[PDB]
Amino acid sequence: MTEYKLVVVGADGVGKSALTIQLIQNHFVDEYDPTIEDSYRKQVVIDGETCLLDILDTAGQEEYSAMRDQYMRTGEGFLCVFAINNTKSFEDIHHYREQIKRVKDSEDVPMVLVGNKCDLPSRTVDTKQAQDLARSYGIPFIETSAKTRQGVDDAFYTLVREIRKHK
Amino acid sequence: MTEYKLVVVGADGVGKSALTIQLIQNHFVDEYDPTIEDSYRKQVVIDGETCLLDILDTAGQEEYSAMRDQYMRTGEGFLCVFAINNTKSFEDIHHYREQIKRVKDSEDVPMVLVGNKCDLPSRTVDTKQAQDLARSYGIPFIETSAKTRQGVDDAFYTLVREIRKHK
Ligand SMILES: O=C1N[C@H](c2c(CNCCCCCCNCc3[nH]c4ccccc4c3[C@H]3NC(=O)c4ccc(O)cc43)[nH]c3ccccc23)c2cc(O)ccc21
Ligand SMILES: Nc1nc2c(ncn2[C@@H]2O[C@H](COP(=O)(O)OP(=O)(O)CP(=O)(O)O)[C@@H](O)[C@H]2O)c(=O)[nH]1
Ligand SMILES: Nc1nc2c(ncn2[C@@H]2O[C@H](COP(=O)(O)OP(=O)(O)CP(=O)(O)O)[C@@H](O)[C@H]2O)c(=O)[nH]1
Ligand SMILES: [Mg+2]
Ligand SMILES: [Mg+2]
């Protein structure tokens, strides 16, 4: 058995909690209830290895920069989430990646860029634009929908694979 | 901590959803997606008190006005929204205010008159005209733009202050 500390980060309302709740509880959260900080455990098998995922579901906006830095130091891998209908959340990605790199004092940190709400037709961030950004960061990119469950398992499992590769 | 049940009402397309989404998610929705009924939570500090805002984003549908009675009974305060480029929506305000007063069986219901889309130069409702009407209603008036965020926080916070005053 191996434990993996995963952190889900991103702007207000991108679907951080809905993505995590889909992985843990296998259903969609339709309601909008802002997160302060929650954590969840999930035991899963990834590439034949027994994994205990310890997932931190973070707030869109931190109250204390120093409190935020602590989970970035502890976290082994980061799911950097934006919503495909929210250009501000996509532009905010750089700020999350820069904060993670600074706290970890490393240019190489396991990360996955997640483009959530891909079920929505009202797209403002194109697929190629997110693919190019992820290519420039040297990280995988996955489109997800916490509503339909599209790409949810793949986003978390890819992050675990990135952590296992880094180790 | 205190919870406040806020209701955003007004005619079709005045920007009820865009105002609420700007308040909580800090981005402007350019798309027009008609609302059936959505609710959102937002934790804020107003005059030193932590407020958990429970905001109901309602439909602009003019048909079956009786469908509004239950949320009008439950709601503690109302954001009565019109668009500054839509004279019909400004004239419709009276119908929303009359229904609220009837359902609540009170002339002193916490309300704020909101003149949305103030970023638009194609104005048909003058600021002074809405100020004059709001004064005759005995309620505050705030101009807002879900696009620029002008007056968005002030509209919701003023409504909370009106509910507190009423208590
Ligand atoms: O004040 C505190 N609240 C905290 C707390 C919570 C968390 N709550 C989170 C919001 C929950 C929204 C629930 C959907 N609320 C949805 C909602 N939002 C509205 C806004 C306006 C009008 C109606 C609604 C409605 C709907 N409700 C109706 O009756 C209705 C009718 C017609 C409609 O069409 C729509 C609606 N749960 C607790 C249980 C016990 C004690 C405290 C709490 C708390 C903790 C604490 O340490 C100290 C103080 C507090
Ligand atoms: N259409 C659609 N809606 C989604 C998707 N993911 C989340 N949502 C919706 O977006 C809203 C916010 O989702 P939530 O998971 O709370 O986002 P969050 O980023 O955790 C909010 P906070 O930053 O305050 O913790 C909810 O109404 C939820 O149903 C998705 O993939 N598609
Ligand atoms: N320029 C400008 N456009 C706005 C503003 N607020 C809303 N809009 C635009 O008006 C249209 C309708 O916005 P929306 O928030 O859906 O209005 P609504 O009142 O919730 C519509 P419904 O009654 O069906 O729920 C959208 O195209 C939106 O971009 C604003 O402050 N400025
Ligand atoms: Mg959340
Ligand atoms: Mg709407």
Curated annotation (Swiss-Prot), chains A, B:
GO annotations of cellular component type: cytoplasm; cytoplasmic side of plasma membrane; cytosol; endoplasmic reticulum membrane; focal adhesion; Golgi membrane; membrane; mitochondrial outer membrane
Post-translational modification: Acetylation at Lys-104 prevents interaction with guanine nucleotide exchange factors (GEFs).
Sequence positions bearing N6-acetyllysine: 104
Effect of residue 22 to R: In NS3; impairs GTPase-activating protein stimulated GTP hydrolysis with unaffected intrinsic functions and a virtually functional effector interaction
Pathological condition linked to this protein in its record: Leukemia, acute myelogenous: A subtype of acute leukemia, a cancer of the white blood cells. AML is a malignant disease of bone marrow characterized by maturational arrest of hematopoietic precursors at an early stage of development. Clonal expansion of myeloid blasts occurs in bone marrow, blood, and other tissue. Myelogenous leukemias develop from changes in cells that normally produce neutrophils, basophils, eosinophils and monocytes. Leukemia, juvenile myelomonocytic: An aggressive pediatric myelodysplastic syndrome/myeloproliferative disorder characterized by malignant transformation in the hematopoietic stem cell compartment with proliferation of differentiated progeny. Patients have splenomegaly, enlarged lymph nodes, rashes, and hemorrhages.
Assembly with partners or alone: Interacts with PHLPP. Interacts (active GTP-bound form preferentially) with RGS14. Interacts (when farnesylated) with PDE6D; this promotes dissociation from the cell membrane. Interacts with SOS1. Interacts (when farnesylated) with GPR31. Interacts with RAP1GDS1. Interacts (active GTP-bound form) with both SHOC2 and PP1c (all isoforms) to form a tertiary complex; SHOC2 and PP1c preferably bind M-Ras/MRAS, but they also bind K-Ras/KRAS, N-Ras/NRAS and H-Ras/HRAS. Interacts (GTP-bound form) with MAPKAP1/SIN1; inhibiting K-Ras/KRAS activity.
NCBIfam families membership: small_GTP
Entry protein name: GTPase KRas
Species name: Homo sapiens (Human)
Highest classification ranks of the organism: Eukaryota, Metazoa, Chordata, Craniata, Vertebrata
Gene name of the record: KRAS
